């Protein structure tokens, strides 16, 4: 789905904390659909540690 290929890659990519961010609680989206924009590329979706 969108779920794996987007949100788990969000899990894999990290930031300032220094790799890791593992074991943390995330508030993600159930289902995500196109809304608008010029051309529907990979598109912005975020997840929150």
């Amino acid at each position: 789905n969108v779920i794996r290929n987007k949100q788990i890659s969000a899990m894999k990519l990290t930031g300032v904390d220094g790799k890791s961010q593992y074991g943390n609680a995330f508030i993600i989206a159930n289902t995500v659909k196109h809304y608008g924009g010029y051309s529907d590329l990979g598109g912005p979706i975020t997840v929150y540690n």
């Binding site: 890659s9 894999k12 990519l13 790799k19």
Partner: protein, 49 residues
């Protein structure tokens, strides 16, 4: 089993490929190239030798 860190241009440098070498075996104490791999710049690499 070895897990190798995500590729870093600073720590690794020019090349994302790596050479795993073997050491104290037989009568040769120095290095012998034992394996080659390609490092992942999106996640850490898992392999069993």
């Amino acid at each position: 089993n070895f897990v190798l860190p995500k590729y870093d241009p600073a720590e690794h440098g020019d090349e994302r490929w790596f050479k795993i070498h073997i050491g104290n075996v037989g009568g040769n104490t120095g290095r012998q190239p034992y394996y080659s791999g390609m490092l992942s710049d999106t996640s850490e690499t898992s392999m069993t030798l």
